[PDB]
Amino acid sequence: IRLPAHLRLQPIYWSRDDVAQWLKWAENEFSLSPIDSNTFEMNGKALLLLTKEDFRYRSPHSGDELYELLQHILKQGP
Ligand SMILES: [Cl-]
């Protein structure tokens, strides 16, 4: 993945602006339906506490994909 540099940190340290940039990157990188940043106005800590369901309610169309992408990020190697 061509993850942005500042996002190479462990997601537990991502800021709220960092998560804003994360949604921008994914939508562009994976051609996802638009995502409002206001939808996911949170830090990395709070974002990691979300369920794929929660992502979907917040983003009905590209929500679950973001969840799984986040899991890939977290899962460096199987
Ligand atoms: Cl913050």
From Swiss-Prot:
Residue pairs linked by disulfide bridges in the UniProt entry: none
Q: Where is this site: Breakpoint for translocation to form PAX5-ETV6?
A: 8-9
All copies of the PNT domain together span 1-76
Annotated site (Breakpoint for translocation to form ETV6-MDS2 in MDS): 7-8
Q: In which tissues is it expressed?
A: Ubiquitous.
| Compartment(s) | Nucleus
Subunit note: Can form homodimers or heterodimers with TEL2 or FLI1. Interacts with L3MBTL1 and HDAC9.
Q: Which disease is it linked to?
A: A chromosomal aberration involving ETV6 is found in a form of chronic myelomonocytic leukemia (CMML). Translocation t(5;12)(q33;p13) with PDGFRB. It is characterized by abnormal clonal myeloid proliferation and by progression to acute myelogenous leukemia (AML). Chromosomal aberrations involving ETV6 are found in acute myeloid leukemia (AML). Translocation t(12;22)(p13;q11) with MN1. Translocation t(4;12)(q12;p13) with CHIC2.
What does the sequence similarity comment in the record state about its family?
A: Belongs to the ETS family.
Q: What does this protein do?
A: Transcriptional repressor; binds to the DNA sequence 5'-CCGGAAGT-3'. Plays a role in hematopoiesis and malignant transformation.
Identify this protein by name: Transcription factor ETV6
Q: What is the lineage of its organism?
A: Eukaryota, Metazoa, Chordata, Craniata, Vertebrata
Query: Entire protein: which part is shown?
Result: 48 to 123 of 452
